[PDB]
């Protein structure tokens, strides 16, 4: 955990659970918006991707 | 900080937000927006030029030193072929 960064970049391979576990701020994003904890690709990807 | 108004008495707002503009403002959302803007902004030289110039000049001078030493070797050591120095 100390040496890793989570990268959601696809509508697959973007599991909210892993990203929220690895970083604090993504977990804050998930807890403030629990409806985003879906897995059907509706989880917001960064605007770049 | 406060606002100075010509009318001393305010009006109660009526009708839809698509005919007169109004700055509605819960305090929590404004504080959250300001914090979010603060984090967003930060989340999105000449000394280097001096380093580059120093390294370029030193590379040139070092290439010169290597070439000078090599030429001195090719002269001095291979001059021994003819027994020039006794």
């Amino acid at each position: 955990i100390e040496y890793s960064l989570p990268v959601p970049f696809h509508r697959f391979y973007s599991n909210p659970t892993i990203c929220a576990a690895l970083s604090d701020d993504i977990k804050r994003y998930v807890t403030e918006f629990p409806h985003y904890h879906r897995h059907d690709g509706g989880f917001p990807l960064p605007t770049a991707f | 900080s406060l606002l100075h108004t010509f009318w001393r008495l305010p009006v109660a707002v009526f009708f839809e937000p698509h005919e007169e503009n109004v700055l509605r403002c819960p305090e929590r959302v404004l504080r959250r927006l300001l914090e979010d803007a603060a984090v967003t902004m930060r989340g999105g030289d000449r000394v280097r030029k001096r380093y580059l110039r120093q390294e370029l000049r030193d590379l040139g001078h070092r290439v010169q030193t290597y070439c000078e030493d090599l030429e001195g070797r090719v002269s001095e050591a291979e001059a021994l072929l003819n027994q020039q120095c006794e």
Binding site: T31, F33, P34, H35, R38, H39, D40, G42 | -
Partner: protein, 49 residues
Amino acid sequence: RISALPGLNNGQLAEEPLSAYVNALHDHRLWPPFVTHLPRNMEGVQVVA
């Protein structure tokens, strides 16, 4: 996974997400009979001893 519809629960209309609106198994008001901790959010909940 069976509890709430993941096709339709993509959004919120209050503090609560739709998944909490559609099934009581999701919302923060139904507590389990046995608790080892207190829950993360207690917006409209007060606890009495």
